[PDB]
Amino acid sequence: LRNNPLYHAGAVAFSISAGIPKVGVLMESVWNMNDSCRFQLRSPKEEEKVNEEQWSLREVVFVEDVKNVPVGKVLKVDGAYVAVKFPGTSSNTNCQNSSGPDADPSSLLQDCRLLRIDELQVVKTGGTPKVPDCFQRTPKKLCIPEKTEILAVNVDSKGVHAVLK
Amino acid sequence: EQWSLREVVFVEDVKNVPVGKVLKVDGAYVAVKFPGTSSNTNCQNSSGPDADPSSLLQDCRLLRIDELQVVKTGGTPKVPDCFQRTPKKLCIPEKTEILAVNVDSKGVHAVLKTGNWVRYCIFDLATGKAEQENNFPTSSIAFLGQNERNVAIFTAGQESPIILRDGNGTIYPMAKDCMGGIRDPDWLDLPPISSLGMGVHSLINLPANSTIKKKAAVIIMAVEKQ
């Protein structure tokens, strides 16, 4: 879909409140980084509600956009419209095994979304557009002034702090 | 051939009014299986349980909901038939006697007697009423002639001219005036006609560049020898 959010429901993130790092699964699609969204904390339906908090994305750091960036196979094209089978479109979560030859062919209709061609973006051999990782995997050099001696250093979210002689 | 719809009569609005069964609804978009949408005319037997599920997709059109109309238990909207299957009465004026009648696409043509008066009448089939009625400029007795049973109003067929006959067997020389009335009789100096033939004939024997049109009325006159 062309109208992709910044992060999708299901992305795993952590928030550091009260010094407790809390790990939670994003419950809704994020459209702007200055908003606040609900996260279900993860290690007859009250237990499902008991572990949601709403947090702002400043506080939250996404580890993974695990899922829910939707890629489907175009099963038909017609005029301005298209039929596309995406993973997870079936409201019947209990139909995870109808991949047999006896799959009621109405189920394949139930599985596919009907959209307009202009609402879709073609996925090329490079995969879906990756959200850039927020972990600086490799060491990055800092611009140390010349002819200076470093007496002490430390770190914080604010950046690097150092005493220079 | 390219035909002007004015001259065409549709016999039966046969087929090609496609009813589809809605197979899936997705917000404002829908998938509908309509008959004859499979470009593979050779898939007429894939109605088995092993029917490749992709074939069902190939068979159904994708549209928006606003482009569709629900078919109710009365079927598709019938185009009204152009053939008046049952007899329809015409609005005949009271106290009139009918001397002759004939037909054409223009409607019904009849000669009506009213006491000592004689009138020529054209009837509209939509309303059933006379579209125009005119008294003859000649004496009514002269039209009634020696034998009123001889009165007639012959036509060549469709799109035809009209030939009246009086009670003497004479062709009555009709013509409209510029007021919509009847001009003085432009006499023909003709003997009586015992019988007259009727029909329309093609003139395709003509060259395509002819000024004479590709149609004509053919009239055969059994003229009496005086």
Numbering used by the authors:
A (entry chain B): 536 to 578, 640 to 761
B (entry chain C): 649 to 874
Sentences from the paper on this structure:
Here, we used genetic screens to identify the HECT-family protein ubiquitin protein ligase E3 component n-recognin 5 (UBR5) as the E3 ubiquitin ligase that governs agonist-induced degradation of numerous NRs and characterized these interactions biochemically and structurally. We next structurally interrogated functional domains in the context of full-length UBR5, which is expressed predominantly as a 310 kDa polypeptide product in humans. Following the RLD, a large helical region forms the core scaffold of UBR5.
Size-exclusion multi-angle light scattering (SEC-MALS) identified a main species with a molecular weight of 1.385 MDa, consistent with a tetrameric assembly. A second dimerization interface holds together two halves of the ring and is markedly more flexible. Despite a lower local resolution in this region, the EM density map is consistent with the structure prediction from AlphaFold, showing tandem small beta bundles (SBBs), spatially separated but swapped in their primary sequences. In the context of the native tetramer, four SBBs link across the halves of the ring. In the structure of the UBR5 tetramer, the four HECT domains protrude towards the center of the ring cavity, separated by ~71 Å (within the same side of the ring) or ~91 Å (across opposite sides of the ring). In the context of the full-length UBR5 tetramer, RARA/RXRA binds proximal to one UBR5 protomer, placing the NR within the ring, adjacent to the HECT domain of its dimerization partner and therefore also in the vicinity of the UBA domains.
